[PDB]
Design a protein around this ligand. Structure first.
Ligand code: K
Ligand code: K
Ligand code: K
Ligand code: K
Ligand code: K
Ligand code: K
Lengths: 96, 96, 96, 96
């Protein structure tokens, strides 16, 4: 457990924190906007996961300024996490 | 065939197993839920592929707890597999 | 121009070939299926690009067996290409 | 701050420039086309972000030649940027 494992390990933990907080903040931001569908927590968590994994079906998405702002954080933290693990497994193989 | 090839090789094999099992379990989980479209195996397999590749058009997606839970596994195993191959080809080039 | 550049270079070239051929074969496969929207070449090329980049909005997608089969090739060749360039730039930085 | 940091650093800066310019050029290209929804700047910026991150929900997408052409640049610059950072963190861990 040097640096190339603690980084990916913390990123995975941080990601889960972002997913939980992101789904919570999304509901807070999306409510008050007529037509918004991202207004309940259980499906907001499902949205955050498919957002952080860059899947993004289209069944759920933010339509507000702060809602979309929260979404961007979920994307970046998502790509970084899934990208930091990739760079982690790369360094592992290089050192044999 | 050291470690940086057996890992990506097994990941590719494991991915296919996840895609097949994921498409099967998705149908089992989605059926019983009014309005769900992911309820037949042939298109479920197509959904699993576009899910694991993080494409996610929006033509098919789970709407149940366990259905979405299966989806998350397909995503993670998908990103990992396509990410483990990337880290595999990286190590190959580093060692010249 | 060793191996970690010719690989990514060929992948980029191969990708364009897949995009052109994929868009052509998609139209051939999707036509004959009632309701299919991926039935003209100019927008098929646009679909292939957003497919290979794993974006996948949902404005265009295959609904046939062979159409979806062509799509999978576009995804895999897409992820590999954009992934082989990433592993190429990684090796470049490692060697200083 | 050698090469494996200035590259990812410039890519991040360049990405923001592409997102801003891309959202601007998208509106210019999409307007004049009946049915197009990507016709205002604030939501165009939101579209560019979810495009560069390869999320692509389906709530917004270009339907014109030049609009889709701008989109491709946003995708490529997006994948490259998020990919150049990944290759940056990889080299960092390899050198210990
Ligand atoms: K996507
Ligand atoms: K979509
Ligand atoms: K994606
Ligand atoms: K998508
Ligand atoms: K959609
Ligand atoms: K990726």
């Amino acid at each position: 457990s040097a640096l190339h494992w603690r980084a990916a390990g913390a990123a995975t933990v941080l990601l889960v924190i972002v997913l939980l907080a992101g789904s919570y903040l999304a509901v807070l931001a999306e409510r008050g906007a007529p037509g918004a569908q991202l207004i309940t927590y259980p499906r907001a968590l499902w949205w955050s996961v498919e957002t952080a994994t860059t899947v993004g079906y289209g069944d759920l998405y933010p339509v507000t300024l702060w809602g979309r702002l929260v979404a961007v954080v979920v994307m970046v933290a998502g790509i970084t996490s899934f990208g930091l693990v990739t760079a982690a497994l790369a360094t592992w193989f290089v050192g044999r």
